[PDB]
Amino acid sequence: STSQVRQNYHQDSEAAINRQINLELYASYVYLSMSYYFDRDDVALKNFAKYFLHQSHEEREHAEKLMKLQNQRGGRIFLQDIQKPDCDDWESGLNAMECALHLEKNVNQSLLELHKLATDKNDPHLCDFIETHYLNEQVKAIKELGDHVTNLRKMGAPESGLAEYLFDKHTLG
């Protein structure tokens, strides 16, 4: 049953990786929802739509990298349902950015728990994988989203449709 390649790879780490794969696919799907919300004719913020679609594809890439890791270490991928996002209507550019920030912080929390598990199981390869490919990406994503939220709020979003319009043009465009 044990993979010929498997070495120093705990069952708990394998399970946590599978959970992280599901979470990344969930995040991708959330961003997809947000993108096409901004593509609606009654919202019509093209650069918001582009930004979130880019994020969706990036999240899928993260999931695929975790799957590659799983196979590299001799674990076995077990996929689960990808839950639909919490919202269909994201209300505003600002609200979407705040929800994205919340999502990214939740993903980061999951990654930090995964790193703690890897450290507890004395799996330095997994710890290094998480540090190298995920933790700084999360810190940067959170910083960027926080900057966006700050700018939108200062500009007067979401009540100032001019605010969101000009943010869409000048920051995201």
Is-contact 6 71, C-beta < 8 A? no
> Which CB, 15 or 170, lies closer to its own copies?
170
Using the rule CB under 5 A, is 62 a contact of Na ion? yes
Q: Binders of its own copies among 121-140, rule CB under 8 A?
A: 122, 124-125, 127-132, 135-136, 138-140
Using the rule CB under 8 A, is 7 a contact of its own copies? yes
Angle of CA points 62, 67, 69, to nearest 5°: 95
Q: Binders of its own copies among 35-64, rule CB under 8 A?
A: 36-37, 39-44, 46, 53, 60, 64
42 phi, psi to nearest 5 deg: -95, 5
Strand (E) or helix (H) holding 169:
none
Q: Binders of Mg ion among 113-172, rule CB under 5 A?
A: 128, 131
Terminal Cα-to-Cα distance of the chain (whole angstroms): 52
The Cα 23–Cα 106 span in angstroms is 9
> Which CB, 76 or 173, lies closer to Mg ion?
173
In the complex, least distance from residue 10 CB atom to Mg ion, rounded to whole angstroms: 19
Question: Is 133 within any annotated ligand binding site?
Answer: no
81 phi, psi to nearest 5 deg: -55, 145
- Contact residues toward Na ion (CB under 5 A) are 24, 59, 62
- Contact residues toward Mg ion (CB under 5 A) are 128, 131
